[PDB]
Amino acid sequence: SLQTSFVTLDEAIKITNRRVNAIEHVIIPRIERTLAYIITELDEREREE
Amino acid sequence: QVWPVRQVRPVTEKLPANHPLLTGQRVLDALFPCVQGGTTAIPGAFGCGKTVISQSLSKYSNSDVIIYVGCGERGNEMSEVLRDFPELTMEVDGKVESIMKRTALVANTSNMPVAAREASIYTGITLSEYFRDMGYHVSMMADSTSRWAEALREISGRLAEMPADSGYPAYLGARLASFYERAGRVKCLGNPEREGSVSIVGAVSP
Amino acid sequence: STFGYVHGVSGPVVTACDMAGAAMYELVRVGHSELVGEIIRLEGDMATIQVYEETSGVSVGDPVLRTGKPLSVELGPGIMGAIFDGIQRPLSDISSQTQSIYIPRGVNVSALSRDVKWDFTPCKNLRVGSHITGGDIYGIVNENSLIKHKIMLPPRNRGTVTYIAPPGNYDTSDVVLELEFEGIKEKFSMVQVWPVRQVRPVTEKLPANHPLLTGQRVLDALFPCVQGGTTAIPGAFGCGKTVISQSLSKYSNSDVIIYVGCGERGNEMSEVLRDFPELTMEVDGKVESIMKRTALVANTSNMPVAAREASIYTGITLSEYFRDMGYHVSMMADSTSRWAEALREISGRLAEMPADSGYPAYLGARLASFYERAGRVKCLGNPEREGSVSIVGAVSPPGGDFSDPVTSATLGIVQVFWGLDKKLAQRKHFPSVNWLISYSKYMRALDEYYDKHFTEFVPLRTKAKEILQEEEDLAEIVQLVGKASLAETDKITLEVAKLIKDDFLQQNGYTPYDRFCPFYKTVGMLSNMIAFYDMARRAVETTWSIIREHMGEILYKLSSMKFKDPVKDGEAKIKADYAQLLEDMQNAF
Amino acid sequence: NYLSQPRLTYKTVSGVNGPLVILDHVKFPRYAEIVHLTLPDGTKRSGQVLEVSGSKAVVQVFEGTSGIDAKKTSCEFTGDILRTPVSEDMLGRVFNGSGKPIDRGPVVLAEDFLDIMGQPINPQCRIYPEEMIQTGISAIDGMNSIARGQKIPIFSAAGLPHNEIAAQICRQAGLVKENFAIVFAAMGVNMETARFFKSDFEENGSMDNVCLFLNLANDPTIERIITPRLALTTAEFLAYQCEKHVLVILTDMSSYAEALREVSAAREEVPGRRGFPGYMYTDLATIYERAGRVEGRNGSITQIPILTMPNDDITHPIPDLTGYITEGQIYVDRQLHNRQIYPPINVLPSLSRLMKSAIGEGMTRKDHADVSNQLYACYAIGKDVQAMKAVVGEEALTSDDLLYLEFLQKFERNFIAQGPYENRTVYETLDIGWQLLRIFPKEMLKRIPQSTLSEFYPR
Ligand SMILES: Nc1ncnc2c1ncn2[C@@H]1O[C@H](COP(=O)(O)OP(=O)(O)O)[C@@H](O)[C@H]1O
Ligand SMILES: [Mg+2]
């Protein structure tokens, strides 16, 4: 009963550890360098005005 | 004959384009094909290969005559052209002749003055439309059309004109439209009833 | 002409007419109340003047009195212990003259009072008829017990002496020197007037070699600064900012300390103005105040914005004036982010084009032209002295991010960056100087002086930094894997790294014996912490468990080396010698 | 031939705002004319005429308008454009940013007076650079090899050792197996930056041919405009008119364009991106395209301009516009500098457009064009694999990609990391490069055909 709980937990804690790191490395830096592009492109409209 | 560069050459009637332009590249000929008499734009940052598409088209296309307009280009890139062109021969009638005999260059490098970038574009497309009327299939490579746009910005800044988006004048899109619309496969004026074409492949530098 | 008329005021700007012989960036006095302005455009006979004060009640026809000078400072005795604002109005003298709690905005009170008498002495072989050039030490005024205010010649003029003053007491208005030149003999008093935007001339620049002994252990060992160098620190709300500023004034090797509070706050400025006159200095004799060698530029946000722009240039000119006497000046500018907001206001006033995030095109040029005024440099003159100017400029970026048009322009110019951290102040890790992001470009210069004076030090720093970087890399895997799977050579690095972070890096500023540790103690505690680390390498590669339980008294000797009181100076080196050999005994066991 | 009429002196200023002085009642003013301002206290300031309209002439003084009077200042109109005194003895000395000697020296004796704006080279008589310069650095000589007559910048940032690799390629510049006259423009530099370059050129004994032009940060910003102009018209003199191979080092080119933005914003000209002027591409190309070699001359000029990109952005207007004019760049990175690699050169955004004609059988040897493309491809895949083991795990990758991990730790530590004074030859670089390709199998090297794999991969 502890054997079959142990073997299905780490194969379900690997898929959670990937979903955290896919947020931390692929999704969060992509939004943050998008948000940096919004700021400098809006500053470039203010100099044109 | 003396023809003004800002005036479109008269011609009998425009024709739809049917024969493709064979650039020699596989991704260019298969997925995104170009015709002779069509308009093409190559944007891209530095180091992407906007001149390797331009040099492989001026060496290996199906076009009768080739012109190459260096508009704000590098000085070494026009000296690169006139070295390997007199040694690259091609075969038309079983005879071998270099591709410099069908090539004509309009060189206005970035060191040269900025208002000549406007004049070098209109000079080329007049030479492109001149060999169109003989019945040849002309292909024109403008490199770069973004330097022509930077020339119009710097001239209109001196006249205190009011700017459109990002500095450029409000008549920027009318200058580009009046230059790409001089291309096309089209039946020429005259009695022997020949047909020519002008292809424009213009590099953009965003 | 001598006066101009107003001919129209449209805000801060006054377009004054009848101004034909006026120069650019010249200061005037507008109106009956004599509001100080600055000539900024000059259209023929008319000049437009931006006025530093509130133009309110200014008529069309009011006299614009031109001064013929640009924004300049008065340099002379009466400047130590004084408190000015950015355009150098004495705030301590202006409250006694008017007996009010405000600044009356029409007050042309002189920066150095002409009523106090100072004991002047000549240069003693500066005879009458002697040729003298600019920068020569002309006399000496005993301003305090500490500061000998050496009267000098201005670097503009030159001549031969015709009259010198006899040694006695004189004002700042008395004529002390007459010099004959080709046309006309010029006379002048002990005070010289020098513009703030113009760098003081000097004989030749020198590379900086002598380090600044700040007193803190993380600052003096890992990330050292030199006198004549440029330093930057983060200026956040509370990490260690007032602690590092007051330790630099109290326990440094520097002769005078100037502090430029530049557009700071309402109540953060009053914290400085009440705490600095009640600090204490440890001279060879009896304890004196820190205000005998201190001059403050106090400038709040309520004050004129063209005084907050000039507060940086006022301070560095006072820094260069006491540099020319031969002293070692250290300047603390707090902060340079509030100064850059004053540039954005002046450029936004004149409708200048915004270059980078609002800030004008010349933001990186004004910052370059300020940090380059600091340096160890041989002064002008024949007595051949040497001086220096150090600059510690605080940076207050938004949100603690180090990507900013002011921050990135600062870190590309400064060489030392003591990275003070907010989270290290949350754990009461004092001082809060982070060691991952901090750096110092002043190692090679220092490397010369440390082989003439300390010798066995450099390699000590290199391996101590190698421990702290390998500790952070190891600490990531402690939560992922565990300490039971870690190798034997690695786990001895972790305990001595914790030993460094508590004994070396942590330093309590209220525990008397730690207020100003001098140098050998700093080479002392690190020579025993890494020799213990080096001896543990071969002792492991010869069990980590048996050494950790049996060295608990020997580790207690290392963890108590910071309590060597200042009644133990030579004895502390003997205890440093004997505590090392107790480690040498237990290596074989 | 010679201007012999006496120059006029005007006390007729009518407006001064910012750096611009407006002179009235000038009789036939001239564009780009140089003038001399005499202040009411006696200090002399120079200035260029940037606009003339009828009788008015708008000049800009180089040292700023601080103190310029309206009634008492006197401007004297030198009847010609700004020409510098250039000579052969203009070599071996250190000068300031404007024109003047620094090391207690005389003014130059002026073999001729050359216009500092120059004039562009005819592209018909400009020969293409072919011979390769061996710089002794494997990241330069191996993967992004420069030619003699090539313009190629060093793309750097603040704090990175770009000055240290600038002095390294000056000591070790030689032909692939009669010295290079180095002209050095120091622009907006620190004092410790100028002392580093002075004490390096005075150390290797090359200071008999160094033309160092230094312009510190305390010096005015309008003099930074004419600083590469004077540093390139002496290099034009030494190479096209004195028959000598010249290496020009421009630093900092970011300090040039930030000084160029200040003058443009003061003239109220039209801005481009981030406040920089619209003619910034032209002004950068009038100092970049003055390089290369011509047909009738045996001398040449190569340019290595150092620029620091703001906030590590390669899409900033400084490295983008210099990337469109020059012939490939060198990218010294920051993430490789933290790992204590002395040239922290990320080779992926590095390029050399003239490297193809400079490699081959006659130039170095047969395998140079092929091992450089394979070292590029294995570094490109292994770095994308490096972004996969940081997000998934160090163990669950493809078995081929563990060799890509073993390649990258051997690439960044053995191939590019060489030390401040080690000067490898080009044959040493390809021999080290084949050692790193040895850890890959023969059939995974896709960019190399099977012919030259037989001669080099079994070893
Ligand atoms: N077909 C190709 N084969 C090999 N290398 C290429 C090819 N196309 C481009 N390159 C490389 O790309 C580099 C940049 O080419 P380039 O035309 O100058 O880009 P751009 O003009 O946009 O700056 C060239 O120097 C060359 O090394
Ligand atoms: Mg190109």
mmCIF file of C-alpha atoms and ligand atoms in Angstrom, chain B residues 51 74 77 143, ligand 2:
data_model
loop_
_atom_site.group_PDB
_atom_site.id
_atom_site.type_symbol
_atom_site.label_atom_id
_atom_site.label_comp_id
_atom_site.label_asym_id
_atom_site.label_seq_id
_atom_site.Cartn_x
_atom_site.Cartn_y
_atom_site.Cartn_z
ATOM 1 C CA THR B 51 22.243 40.574 -49.935
ATOM 2 C CA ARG B 74 27.868 49.442 -48.215
ATOM 3 C CA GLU B 77 29.110 45.366 -51.308
ATOM 4 C CA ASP B 143 18.883 47.789 -51.533
HETATM 5 MG MG MG E 2 23.109 43.872 -46.968
#
